[PDB]
Amino acid sequence: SIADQSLAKRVQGVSQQAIDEGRIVGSVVLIARHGRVIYANASGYADREQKKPMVRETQFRLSSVSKPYITLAAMRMIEQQKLGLDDTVSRWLPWFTPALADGVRPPIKIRHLLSHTAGLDYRLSQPAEGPYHRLGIKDGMELSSLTLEQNLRLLAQADLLAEPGSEFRYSLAIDVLGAVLEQVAGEPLPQVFNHWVAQPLGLRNTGFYTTDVDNLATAYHDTAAEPEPIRDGMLLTLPEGFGFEIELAPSRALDAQAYPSGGAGMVGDADDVLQLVETLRTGKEGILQPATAALMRQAHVGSHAETQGPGWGFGFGGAVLEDAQLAATPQHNGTLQWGGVYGHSWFYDPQAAISVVALTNTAFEGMSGRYPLQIRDAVYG
């Protein structure tokens, strides 16, 4: 088609510009319509200093692209009625019984974990010496000596910020969900993901760490003019509205001992993410029922929450577009979208039958910069 190579023109243009402007170091961008890959492109370098070209198979640190993966594992367990949307967390983790400031211990429901209404927080959303800092809670991307259980027992000792269900607050909820999933299946989270997602979806290269050092894109972050590599334990200022300071340790991805963070700890390639997003868009025979897919993109949290700015609520696995006009996007209502601080965006538009995966090795341009939006614009011409 001329329309397909017309798209290739626009998208390629946005990526090449972003490299020459030193906004992006490297990216892999995949676009499907009705499930068929209409565009696939690796641009720039996996590693600039070694001039290793980015290729389609290049693996990334996924950060929050981990969430829709583990949300999918849960929704499958829920389809099979091994888990309930209205199960308490304490039913599965008897010691996870956090309190509000006034001492009340309200039940947290699985649906609250899925939509980040559990009253949980992120340490990166808290100022220095805030309650999560003082307790030594980990967000899933930094070095630590903890097991998941040890980290969630620390989280259990922190105040909730609100009644479970009363408001959206981006959270460690999916790290908690991971531990629930372990109790449901009777095995650790990496084995849960392998059995419940990777094998059914035929994923080639996605998990909680990699032994393939050379094929993992080097993480970069935005500086003065040019992007420099992220050093283990670097404290980066999050863009305004995203939080305060985030602790990143790019070596964590290589550590087979690092606790499995359902919210932020996974690694994987763009094609595995596209399999995931197509699955969320339509379901698949013997994996996810269309009805479950439709459930996951309801506005369980209303667009009052502004989860990607005005017009965006939240479902199960990402933000739900309720008002495309208010949000000034060519995306259509029902669009499911989220990203990753390491530098990623993804969405399916159910009306246009399209899925977009935009993995970069550049934080925060790939997540919150102009790049994800100009790609978005290139898809809809």
Residue with tokens 């304490």: 90
Q: By C-alpha distance, which of 259, 240, 249 is closest to 172?
A: 259
One-letter amino acid of 76: R
Q: What are the DSSP E strand ranges found in the chain?
A: 26-33, 36-47, 52-53, 60-61, 220-221, 228-229, 234-237, 245-248, 267-268, 312-314, 319-321, 336-340, 344-349, 354-360, 362-363
Half-sphere exposure of 298 (CA within 13 A, CB side): 9
Separation between Cα atoms, residue 234 and residue 88, nearest integer Å: 36
Rounded to whole angstroms, the Cα distance separating 19 from 3 reads 25
SS3 89: coil
Alpha-carbon distances of 131 from 113, 122, 331, rounded to whole Å = 20, 10, 38
Token pair, residue 163, equals 């009644």
Q: How far is CA 226 from CA 4, 217, 332, 371, in A?
A: 33, 17, 35, 15
| All residues at 6 or more sequence positions from 252 whose CB lies less than 8 Å from its CB, including other chains | 141, 142, 143, 209, 258, 265
Counting beta carbons within 10 angstroms of the beta carbon of residue 175, is it exposed (0 to 12), middle (13 to 18) or buried (19 or more)?
buried
**Catalytic entry in 27, 43, 63, 64:** 64
Exposed, middle or buried: residue 370 (CB in 10 Å: 0-12, 13-18, 19+)? middle
DSSP 3-state of 363: strand
| CA dist., res. 264 & res. 342, Å (int) | 10
Distance CA 65, CA 324 (A): 23
Three-state secondary structure call for residue 304:
helix
Residue type at position 168: F
Q: Which domains does the chain have, with CATH numbers?
A: 2-70+200-220+260-380 (3.40.710.10)
Helix axes 270-282, 66-79, angle to 10 degrees: 40
Q: The tokens of 182 are what?
A: 């372990």
Distance from C-alpha of 34 to C-alpha of 50, rounded to nearest angstrom: 38
**Quick check: bond before 364 cis, omega within 30?**
yes
- Would you call 257 exposed, middle or buried from its count of C-beta atoms within 10 A (0-12, 13-18, 19+)? exposed
Q: Residue 259 CB: number of other CB atoms within 10 A? A: 24
Q: Which two three-digit tokens encode residue 310?
A: 């005005």
Instruction: Verify whether residue 43 is a known catalytic residue.
Output: no
For residue 236, give the nearest of 338, 139, 119 by alpha carbon.
Answer: 139
